[PDB]
Amino acid sequence: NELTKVKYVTEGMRKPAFLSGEQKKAIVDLLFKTNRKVTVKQLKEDYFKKIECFDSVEISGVEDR
DNA sequence: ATGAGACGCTGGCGATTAGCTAATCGCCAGCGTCTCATCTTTATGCGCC
C-alpha cells in the first residue's frame, strides 16, 4: 500500500509514472526483504542504480524514509 | 285549708419550674504500591476524485 504511490521518474521520462506491479515485487525482494527498514535514500541508491541503472530517481509518494 | 324564690379576689405581681434552636467558626476529610495484559487517541511525517 505504501509502494503503490512510490512514483518513479526516469531521467528520460516525460511524465511521472507510479511503479509497476513487477517493479514493486523487485523493490520488495531486493531491499524490503533484506533490511529491517529501508530509507528512501537507500531504496534510491541500492535499487534503481543496481537494477534500473537510472542516473537519478525522483520519489513523489513517501518522505525521508 | 303554705311555705320557695335572691349563691366567692382576681389580677398582677414574683417566682418558680420548664425547656430550646440558632448563629459562628473551625476542622477536616483513607491511602500506599506493584504486576500483568488490554485497547484506544493525540503531535509530526504521504495520496485528487
Side-chain angles (χ1 to χ4, degrees), chain A residues 3-7 9 16-17 19 48 57 59-61:
Chain A
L3 188 37
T4 198
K5 294 301 178 180
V6 178
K7 294 183 178 180
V9 179
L19 281 165
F48 265 85
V57 212
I59 318 301
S60 58

Side-chain angles (χ1 to χ4, degrees), chain A residues 26-32 34-36 38 42 46-47:
Chain A
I27 290 285
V28 173
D29 283 275
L30 179 59
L31 292 178
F32 278 178
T34 330
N35 200 329
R36 310 292 202 274
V38 185
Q42 271 183 343
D46 299 342
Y47 168 78

Side-chain angles (χ1 to χ4, degrees), chain A residues 30 46-48 51-54:
Chain A
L30 179 59
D46 299 342
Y47 168 78
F48 265 85
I51 297 299
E52 305 298 280
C53 296
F54 292 165

